Structure formats: structure tokens, C-alpha cells
């Protein structure tokens, strides 16, 4: 239906053929469904994985390799006949090391968004409709919406479709349709047309959007459109915008990028200036300007050696990891720092119920007035059985099974919370369970009601589906609904405002039924019934009522208590404004204390564990709920938060309590306190807001539209997949699974991230510094050159790859979890860990050279032997006084110079094995703890060998092969940088700090 806005409800009834409270029949189903489709999108998908290789070249450090690749390629057209093979497989070097990376990247990516689709589909989404099938509303998959039913959406829930809004049935209806309009704040819905059928959505007041929020309220409407039709559909196949942004650790290692790229730029032109008295000679033989091109390309090699290619594939590689293993852990991750936050996260704060607790609720005690005499008060206690939503249980006096309308009291009792209540429940014909509509207390009333048959309805007759609601209806046809005054958070209580049905009860008059948090309840009555009459609220009426609350609540059960209560003499209807909910309070005054009921809603078994994990990590874990202090303490308990016997004075507030506190002293109780109760949306992230000016990390967890400001508020805020839409759109993770672990586990994630990218920076680092203190020692001391431009790309090609970018499958350090969050203060790179840098930079360098030059001393048997005479090698052709009388060229030997590229590749090998782990030795972290880095070594050893060995290749790279004794020369030298790091790993660990 084009246009629904400008037509009336009438109309739009009419135009499908629909009773309003009714719906369509399972015929106009099946009909409307071949007409219209179902209601859906085409499907994302993933075939030609470019724009995902493309990405893989945007980076800075990339792209000037890419730049390199072509000046090589100009520059081969400058090279002249003799040494032309030697020149084109130069490109080819520095292009093998990119196109690696990227095939990971992308590789990595692929299997991320995979692990992503197949969670994001796993659970179907659901919708409520009114359908001729059943009486009730009915639960169905939102693709099975077609225009025409009638579906009914509440506070919290998201839009299924393109709704007509047929009645209104809270005192105002508030939705967030920020992702379609752009508008911030939510928007007040009417259900009078809009005569303007060209109208824009904002000016459609009467319309409910697909993919929207109701941010307060229920409503009942009639579909317009579903599928690609709808209003948010046509912007989804064309406009599909990315909300794509690098991580502030990405942005950070970005900026160390540019830092390095810059430092390595100078030390860079530091080598083509300090060889300036060699573009003149014999070696090269050409002209000033000639030899000027040679030097160029040294640099150029060495700065290709020396940028770390794989930095920004490794970070996005590990970030595509980090979101597939929460993916396999059931989390879905919404945004991308996420996982990293988490890590530096040393407060978690929650919600309670539907959270911290399953949100299976029942109630299994009630009870109402029995006798009260003067400063006697007894109460009629009751227990029901059954746990889950169905309507299967008993209600039971002193272990015998009762007929509730045995009680005037209980008919009553369950009067309220039949017609006091927003919620229904639905039987699930698939999985053969009876499920909730709305919210859960709500429901554990709904299903409580069922179980009092209090009219002494004939149920055992009827289907699963017709038995759902039965006593409930039966309730319904006693007393009409006029308005409902809805649940608010500060009032803690709902109100329904009803006539009677004008057959029985008609004699009397209109009604109020309310339904609330016993505080608050309890102090707005001036009567108790008792039976069927009525007597003052005493204070010995009043104390009794609230000591077997306290009891229920602070009891093993720890139960959630709601107290039930009607107005006897409401005001008159037309003396009640409901444009503001501040006044509903006062309509909710001078009542009546019928009774409570207290419900279980056992806590999450996972979560105990949690806390004591996150205590181990130096996480504190804070409640923050709505609920009683004293509950809320006993679930503390029973869950860690607090010890069994722990006192709680300090450390637990109510909201009231809180709000009494100095503004100074609200935020210390909350780096003190660990449990808040009868709180409010606003404190939530209130005590957020005060924990985060103490510079901590915070996260928020809940399911609840009352959390969503604090979960906006956190660094980052993890809804659960089982609580309301509302929730999950200001969330950064979704508990698909409502698994409270997989918090602890997206902690443990974000630090290995974090520390896998603290070892591929020692690698690199540590690595690359000495093969840039290697060309300089060798310019310092006077030697010959101990590398060419061609063999500096190939120590890159061999070391700064996939052994580096291995370094990202790094499995998380011992005590990973035990160790207190990093600062957000703490900077990237320590002063004591750029020492260990140099240490080991200064040392690979040196290594290089002495390896050189013990080619040219110490070896016997490897030709040419000399002392000191290395110093002045530039000589012979002129001045020979102390030389042996062997040849005047031997300074050109390739044999000194595959030394020292086969150490600086050997050396590298094992600087690789030292980047398992920071400070834990490498005996303690085993180098078979990452096979991903021992198969990339070998891959490098022996594509090294590849280059001795296979015949073309030692004249093109400009080698000769190595002796088995000038091999174990090599190994002599370079295993030593294992034991080297070893000691300033037990330096950092036993004498520093561990
Ligand atoms: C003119 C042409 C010149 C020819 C010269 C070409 C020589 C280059 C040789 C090989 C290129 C290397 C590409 C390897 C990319 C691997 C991508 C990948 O699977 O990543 C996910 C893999 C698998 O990780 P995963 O995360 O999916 O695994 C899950 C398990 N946990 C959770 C425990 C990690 O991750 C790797 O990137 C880790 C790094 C190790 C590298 C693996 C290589 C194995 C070693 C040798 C085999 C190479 C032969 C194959 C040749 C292919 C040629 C195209
Ligand atoms: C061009 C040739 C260069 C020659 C320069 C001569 C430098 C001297 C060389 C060797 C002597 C070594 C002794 C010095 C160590 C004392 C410094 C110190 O206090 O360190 C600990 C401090 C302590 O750091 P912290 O405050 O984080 O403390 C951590 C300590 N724990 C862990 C115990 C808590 O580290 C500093 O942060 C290091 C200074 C950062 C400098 C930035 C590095 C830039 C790198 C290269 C730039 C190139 C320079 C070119 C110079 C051009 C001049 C115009
Ligand atoms: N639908 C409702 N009608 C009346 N009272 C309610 C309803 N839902 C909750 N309450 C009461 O209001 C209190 C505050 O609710 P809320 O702020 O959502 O906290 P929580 O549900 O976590 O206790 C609850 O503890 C409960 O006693
Ligand atoms: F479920 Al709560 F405060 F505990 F919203
Ligand atoms: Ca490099
Ligand atoms: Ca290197
Ligand atoms: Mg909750
Ligand atoms: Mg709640």
C-alpha cells in the first residue's frame, strides 16, 4: 500500500479486507505471500574478493614500495647488455613480498566475514501478529510479514516492516528512526492521516519504518509495504554506504608508520651523502653521475629493507582474526575496536536482570492480607510450581493444591496482573515450549494467572496455543481497558485505568490496577484489602508486608518482588491529563495493598566464573540495576561480586542513597562501591560517566532499554542477543549466545592483538636497525661493501614476510590473565624495550660485518688471507707496502658477501624465534608454540637455499656457495642472538618488573 499515511485506519483495514483485533486468515496468508513475496532483502554475498585486494595497496608503507618497483622497472631500461638479468628480477623482490601479505589479508578477511554471515543468520528474527489463526498475538518469522497483518511492536523492539499506525495503546509512542531520517532524539507517532501523499518521512507521523526502534510505548498497526518496498528497502540496494573506520590502535601503529618512514627517509639520504667519494670508481668505473645512480639504488634497496611492509596487513589481519574467534565464541561484533578495547578494559559494569540473570522468571510465592487486629498482622502465603512459562503448575497452602478462588484476595491478585499487563504469552508449536510476548515479569504474571484458574475455567479441552492465555482472557471480558498509564522507571510501578464489563461488577464503578516496585507501591496505599474488604494501612500492617519482601528477596531464592494494588476511587477520566508521565504517580495514590507476588530468575551459570576471571585480570565487575538493594546485594553474593558474609555498607547504594551523596563524593563510592540498586537510565551512565574521569576503560552490559544511555556512554558496550533491539543498536558486541564468558574471552583477545603487534614491531625493528648498522659499520670502519642493492632486497623479501607476519598467529602469553589492564597512558614502545631494540639491532650489525671479515681473516681454507689490510682495501692499485702479493680484485669477491647475507637471513631466523614473546623465555614459551612462524622459516631457509644452489641463481643475487663449515660459521654467529635476548628477558622479568 502506497500512500498509507494519507489514508485513515478505516481505510486501510478496508483496502486488505482485515478485522483491526482479528488479523488475516492462514488463506490471505498464503495469498499475500505469492502476491507481495516475503519480507526481505536480497542477500549480501562475497564472489570476487578485488575491492578486498585492492585495499590490500592503500597503505603509505605499501605504496612506496610500489613506487620502488617502478623506478626498478624505469631503471631497467637504463641498464646496459652485460648485467641486464641481474636488473629485472629486482621488481620482481620487492612485488613477491606485497603480493604475499595480501593473499593472507585477504585470505583472512574472506574467512572473517564467512564466520560473520553465519552467526548474523543463524537465529531468524521475529515478529508479532495478530492473525485470524489464534486469539492471541502470535510470534512469526519477520520474512513471513506480508501487507495486510496486523502486527503489534513495543518499547525496545525493532520495526519489522512498513507499518500504518492503527492505535496507540500507551500514552505516547516514541521512536528512533535515526538510520533513516538522521534525527537524533526520538519522534512522537499520532494515528491521524497525513493528507500530503508526497510527503517526507519525517512529516509521516502516523508510520512506523522497517529497521526502526520504539523508544517508548506499544502499539497496534497495519503493514503498508515489506521487502525492497519499504522505505528503508530502496536505500539498502542502491545506497549501501560503508560505516568503514580504522581503530584508534590502528590509527596509532599508522602514526608509528609514518614516524619510522620518515626516520628511515633520513638514514636513507645519510647513505647516498656519506658515499659521495665513491660515485668515482674503479668497482663501477663510471662517470660522476653513474655512480651517483648505484648509491640511489642502495638507498632505495635499504629503505625497502628497512619499512615494514607487513605492519598494516598484519594489524588488519589480526583484528579479521580477532572478529572470527569471537564469531566461533558466538559474539557479534559491530564495530571494530571492539576487541582491542576490551583489552584495556579495568571496569565492566552491568545490568542485573536478563543479563547477569537468564530472565526465565516465575513466580513461586504470592500472598495477600489473612487477618489484621490492631498490632496483629497475618498474611496468606502460597507457593507455585513450575518453572518455565507454561501454564502447568499448582498453587499450593501448606503443601496441599488450592482452588485460588477459594481467596477473595488471589481473584483479585490475579485480576491485576491479567489486566494490568502488556505482555501475553505464545505457544511455539515447533519447539513444543511456551514463549514469552513482551517483557518477562510480565509474562512469569501471565503464565501465574494461567495457573490460578480463579474462575474455575474448563482448560483441559483445549490446544497448547488456546490454553496460553485462556484464564487470562476470561479476566479480560470482566473489566474494560480504557488506558493504560505504562511502566516508568522513576515511578517503578504501572497503572491500567479499567470500567467493568456492565453484567456483574457493574454496580460499582471504574477501577484502577497497579502493579509496581513494592517501595513505591506500598507507600501510595492508605488501605489493605482483606478479602473483599478494606481496612487503614497501619504501620504494623505495613512493617509485616515488608519483612516477608525483605525475607523473599535477601533470601537463597533471592526473589523479585512486585506488589499489587488498585484506587478504588480513581479520579475522574476526564480529570486525568496523559500528555505528561510526571503526573501518573499522583493517579497511582490512596490505594489499596492486595498483595505481592516474588519471582525466581536464577543468575546465568557462567557468571561467578566470569567475575573471578575478570578479578584475576584486575577487572572490577560493578551491578547496576533497577531492582531491590536487598535482591540485589544476594544476587552480588551469589555470584562473587561480594562475599557471602562480606560487609556492604561502603559498597552498596541505592539510587536515593547515591543521589543524597555530594557530587565529589558520588564518584569515589563509585571506584568503591560494586552494587547499585533502585537506580535509574540516567545513573547508569552516570556512574559510567564518574568511573571514566578516573581515566578508566569502561565497558556496560545489558538487555534493556534502560541501559542503552550507559552502553552509549561506555568504551564499549555488549548487549545481549536475547534482550531488546534497542540495546543491541548501542552496543559494539552482541551476545548472540547471552554467554557472559565470551566478555572475559574478548579481553583475552584484545591484549594478545595487542601484544602480537608488540612483537612484530620487536621483529621488524630490532631485525631491520641492524641491517642498516651493518651498510653503516662497513662505510665506518673502511671495509668493502658487504651487500649490493639486489641483496638487500632479498635479506627483506626473506625476513620481513611471512616470518614477521606470522608473528600475528602468536599464541597469548602464560599470564596473559593475570596481569592488571594497560594504561591508556602507556605509550607503544617503552624506553627500556627501544634499548632492547638497539641491543639487538647493534649486535645483528655486527655479526654481519665480523662475519664478512672473518672471511677475509680467520678462514683458512675460504680463499684469501690477510690481516688489518681490510681498512685499506682502496690501495693495492696504487700503494701496496704490506700486502701479502695475492690479487689486487679479491675485494670483490662474492664468497665474503654471501657470508654476510647468509648470517643477516640466519640471524633474522632466529631473531624470529625471540618474538614469540616479550619477556617469557623462549624454553618457557616454546618455538613450537607457533608451527605458523617454524613453517615460515623454513620456507625462507630453504627458498635461501634455492638461491645458492639452483645454477642461475648465485649469478644473478651474486653469490657463491657457502662450505658445511663456513655454515656452521654461520650458525657459530647467529644463534647467539637467542642467548643474547634471553639474558635482557631475564633482565626485564627477574630485575626490572615481570
Ligand atoms: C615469477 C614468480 C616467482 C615465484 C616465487 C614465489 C614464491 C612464493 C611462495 C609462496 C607464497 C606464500 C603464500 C602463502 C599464503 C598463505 C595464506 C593462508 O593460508 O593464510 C592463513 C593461514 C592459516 O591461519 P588460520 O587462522 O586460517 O588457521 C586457524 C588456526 N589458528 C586459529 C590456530 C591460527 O595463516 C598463515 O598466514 C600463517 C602464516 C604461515 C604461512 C603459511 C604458509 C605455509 C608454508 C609453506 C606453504 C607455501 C606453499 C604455497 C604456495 C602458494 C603460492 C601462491
Ligand atoms: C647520528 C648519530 C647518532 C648519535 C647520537 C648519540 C646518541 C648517544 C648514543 C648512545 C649512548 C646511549 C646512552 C643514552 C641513553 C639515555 C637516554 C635515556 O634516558 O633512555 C631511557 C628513556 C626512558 O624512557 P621511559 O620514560 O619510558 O622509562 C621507561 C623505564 N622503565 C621501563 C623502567 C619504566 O627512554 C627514552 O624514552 C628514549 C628517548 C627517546 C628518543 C627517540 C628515539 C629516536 C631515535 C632515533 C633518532 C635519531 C637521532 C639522531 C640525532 C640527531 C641530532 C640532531
Ligand atoms: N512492567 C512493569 N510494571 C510494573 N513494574 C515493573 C515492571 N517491570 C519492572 N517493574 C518494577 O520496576 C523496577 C525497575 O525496573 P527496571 O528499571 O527495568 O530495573 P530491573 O527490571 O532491572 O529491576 C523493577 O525492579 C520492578 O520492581
Ligand atoms: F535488568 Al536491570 F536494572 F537489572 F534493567
Ligand atoms: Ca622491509
Ligand atoms: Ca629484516
Ligand atoms: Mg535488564
Ligand atoms: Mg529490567
Not at 602514526?255 to 665513491?278: D, P, T, Y
Not at 534497542?726 to 564468558?741: G, I
Not at 632492547?836 to 647493534?842: K, L, P, S, W
Request: aromatic fraction near 8%; include cysteine; proline fraction near 5%.
Amino acid at each position: 500500500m502506497e500512500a498509507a499515511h494519507s489514508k485513515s485506519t478505516e481505510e486501510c483495514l478496508a483496502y486488505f479486507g482485515v478485522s483491526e483485533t482479528t488479523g488475516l486468515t492462514p488463506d490471505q496468508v498464503k495469498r499475500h505471500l505469492e502476491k507481495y513475496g516475503h519480507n526481505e532483502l536480497p542477500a549480501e554475498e562475497g564472489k570476487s574478493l578485488w575491492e578486498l585486494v585492492i585495499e590490500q595497496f592503500e597503505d603509505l608503507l605499501v605504496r612506496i614500495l610500489l613506487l620502488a618497483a617502478c623506478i626498478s622497472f624505469v631503471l631497467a631500461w637504463f641498464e646496459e647488455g652485460e648485467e641486464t638479468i641481474t636488473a629485472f628480477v629486482e621488481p620482481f623482490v620487492i612485488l613477491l613480498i606485497l603480493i604475499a601479505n595480501a593473499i593472507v589479508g585477504v585470505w583472512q578477511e574472506r574467512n572473517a566475514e564467512n564466520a560473520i554471515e553465519a552467526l548474523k543468520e543463524y537465529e531468524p528474527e521475529m515478529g508479532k501478529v495478530y492473525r485470524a489463526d489464534r486469539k492471541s498475538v502470535q510470534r512469526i518469522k519477520a520474512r513471513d510479514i506480508v501487507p495486510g497483518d496486523i502486527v503489534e511492536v513495543a518499547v525496545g523492539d525493532k520495526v519489522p516492516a512498513d507499518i500504518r499506525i492503527l492505535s496507540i495503546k500507551s500514552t505516547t509512542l516514541r521512536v528512533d528512526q535515526s538510520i533513516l531520517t538522521g534525527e537524533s532524539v526520538s519522534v512522537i507517532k499520532h494515528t491521524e492521516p497525513v493528507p500530503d501523499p508526497r510527503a517526507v518521512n519525517q512529516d509521516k507521523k502516523n508510520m512506523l519504518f522497517s529497521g526502526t526502534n520504539i523508544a517508548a510505548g506499544k502499539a497496534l498497526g497495519i503493514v503498508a509495504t515489506t521487502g525492497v518496498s519499504t522505505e528503508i528497502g530502496k536505500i539498502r540496494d542502491q545506497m549501501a554506504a560503508t560505516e568503514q573506520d580504522k581503530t584508534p590502535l590502528q590509527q596509532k601503529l599508522d602514526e608509528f608508520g609514518e614516524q619510522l618512514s620518515k626516520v628511515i627517509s633520513l638514514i636513507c639520504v645519510a647513505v647516498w651523502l656519506i658515499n659521495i667519494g665513491h660515485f668515482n670508481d674503479p668497482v663501477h668505473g663510471g662517470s660522476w653521475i653513474r655512480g651517483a645512480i648505484y648509491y640511489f639504488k642502495i638507498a632505495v634497496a635499504l629503505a625497502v629493507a628497512a619499512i615494514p611492509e607487513g605492519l598494516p596487513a598484519v594489524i588488519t589481519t589480526c583484528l579479521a582474526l580477532g572478529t572470527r574467534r569471537m564469531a566461533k565464541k558466538n559474539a557479534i561484533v559491530r564495530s571494530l575496536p571492539s576487541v582491542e578495547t576490551l583489552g584495556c578494559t579495568s571496569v565492566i559494569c552491568s545490568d542485573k536482570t536478563g543479563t547477569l540473570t537468564t530472565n526465565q522468571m516465575s513466580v513461586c510465592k504470592m500472598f495477600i492480607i489473612d487477618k489484621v487486629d490492631g498490632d496483629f498482622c497475618s498474611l496468606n502465603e502460597f507457593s507455585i510450581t513450575g518453572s518455565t512459562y507454561a501454564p502447568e503448575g499448582e498453587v499450593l497452602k501448606n503443601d496441599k493444591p488450592i482452588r485460588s478462588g477459594q481467596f477473595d484476595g488471589l481473584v483479585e491478585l490475579a485480576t491485576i496482573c491479567a489486566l494490568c499487563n502488556d505482555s501475553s504469552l505464545d505457544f511455539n508449536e515447533t519447539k513444543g515450549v511456551y514463549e514469552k510476548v513482551g517483557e518477562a515479569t510480565e509474562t512469569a504474571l501471565t503464565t501465574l494467572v494461567e495457573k490460578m484458574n480463579v474462575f474455575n475455567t474448563e482448560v483441559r479441552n483445549l490446544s497448547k496455543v488456546e490454553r496460553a492465555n485462556a484464564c487470562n482472557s476470561v479476566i479480560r471480558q470482566l473489566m474494560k481497558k480504557e488506558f493504560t498509564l505504562e511502566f516508568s522507571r522513576d515511578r517503578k510501578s504501572m497503572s491500567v485505568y479499567c470500567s467493568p464489563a456492565k453484567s456483574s461488577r457493574a454496580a460499582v464503578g471504574n477501577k484502577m490496577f497497579v502493579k509496581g516496585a513494592p517501595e513505591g507501591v506500598i507507600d501510595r496505599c492508605n488501605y489493605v484489602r482483606v478479602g473483599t474488604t478494606r481496612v487503614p494501612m497501619t504501620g504494623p500492617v505495613k512493617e509485616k508486608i515488608l519483612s516477608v519482601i525483605k525475607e523473599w528477596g535477601t533470601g537463597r531464592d533471592t526473589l523479585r518482588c512486585l506488589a499489587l494494588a488498585t484506587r478504588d476511587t480513581p479520579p475522574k477520566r476526564e480529570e486525568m491529563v496523559l500528555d505528561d508521565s510526571s503526573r501518573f504517580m499522583e493517579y497511582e495514590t490512596d490505594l489499596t495493598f492486595v498483595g505481592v507476588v516474588g519471582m525466581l530468575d536464577p543468575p546465568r551459570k557462567e557468571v561467578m566464573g566470569s567475575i573471578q576471571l575478570c578479578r584475576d585480570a584486575g577487572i572490577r565487575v560493578i551491578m547496576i540495576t533497577g531492582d531491590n538493594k536487598g535482591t540485589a546485594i544476594a544476587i552480588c553474593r551469589r555470584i562473587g561480586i561480594f562475599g557471602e558474609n562480606e560487609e556492604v555498607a561502603d559498597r552498596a547504594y541505592t539510587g536515593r542513597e547515591f543521589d543524597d551523596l555530594p557530587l565529589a563524593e558520588q564518584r569515589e563510592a563509585c571506584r568503591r562501591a560494586c552494587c547499585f540498586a533502585r537506580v535509574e537510565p540516567s545513573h547508569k551512565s552516570k556512574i559510567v560517566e564518574y568511573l571514566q574521569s578516573y581515566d578508566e576503560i569502561t565497558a556496560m552490559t545489558g538487555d534493556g532499554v534502560n541501559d542503552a544511555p550507559a552502553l552509549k556512554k561506555a568504551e564499549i558496550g555488549i548487549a545481549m542477543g536475547s534482550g531488546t533491539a534497542v540495546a543491541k543498536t548501542a552496543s559494539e558486541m552482541v551476545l548472540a549466545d547471552d554467554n557472559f564468558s565470551t566478555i572475559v574471552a574478548a579481553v583475552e583477545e584484545g591484549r594478545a592483538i595487542y601484544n602480537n603487534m608488540k612483537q612484530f614491531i620487536r621483529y621488524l625493528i630490532s631485525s631491520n636497525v641492524g641491517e642498516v648498522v651493518c651498510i653503516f659499520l662497513t662505510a665506518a670502519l673502511g671495509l668493502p661493501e658487504a651487500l649490493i642493492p639486489v641483496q638487500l632486497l632479498w635479506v627483506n623479501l626473506v625476513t620481513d614476510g611471512l616470518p614477521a607476519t606470522a608473528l600475528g598467529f602468536n599464541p597469548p602469553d602464560l599470564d596473559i590473565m593475570d596481569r592488571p589492564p594497560r594504561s591508556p597512558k602507556e605509550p607503544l614502545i617503552s624506553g627500556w624495550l627501544f634499548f632492547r631494540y638497539m641491543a639487538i639491532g647493534g649486535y645483528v650489525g655486527a655479526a654481519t660485518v665480523g662475519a664478512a671479515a672473518w672471511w677475509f681473516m680467520y678462514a683458512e681454507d675460504g680463499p684469501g688471507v690477510t690481516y688489518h689490510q681490510l681498512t685499506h682495501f682502496m690501495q693495492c692499485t696504487e700503494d701496496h707496502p704490506h700486502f701479502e702479493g695475492l690479487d689486487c680484485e679479491i675485494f670483490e669477491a662474492p664468497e665474503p658477501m654471501t657470508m654476510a647475507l647468509s648470517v643477516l637471513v640466519t640471524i633474522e631466523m632466529c631473531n624470529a624465534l625471540n618474538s614469540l614473546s616479550e619477556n617469557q623465555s623462549l624454553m618457557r614459551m616454546p618455538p613450537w608454540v607457533n608451527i605458523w612462524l617454524l613453517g615460515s622459516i623454513c620456507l625462507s631457509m630453504s627458498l635461501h637455499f634455492l638461491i645458492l644452489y639452483v645454477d642461475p641463481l648465485p649469478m644473478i643475487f651474486k653469490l657463491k656457495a657457502l662450505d658445511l663449515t663456513q655454515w656452521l660459521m654461520v650458525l657459530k654467529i647467529s644463534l647467539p642472538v637467542i642467548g643474547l635476548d634471553e639474558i635482557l628477558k631475564f633482565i626485564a622479568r627477574n630485575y626490572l618488573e615481570g
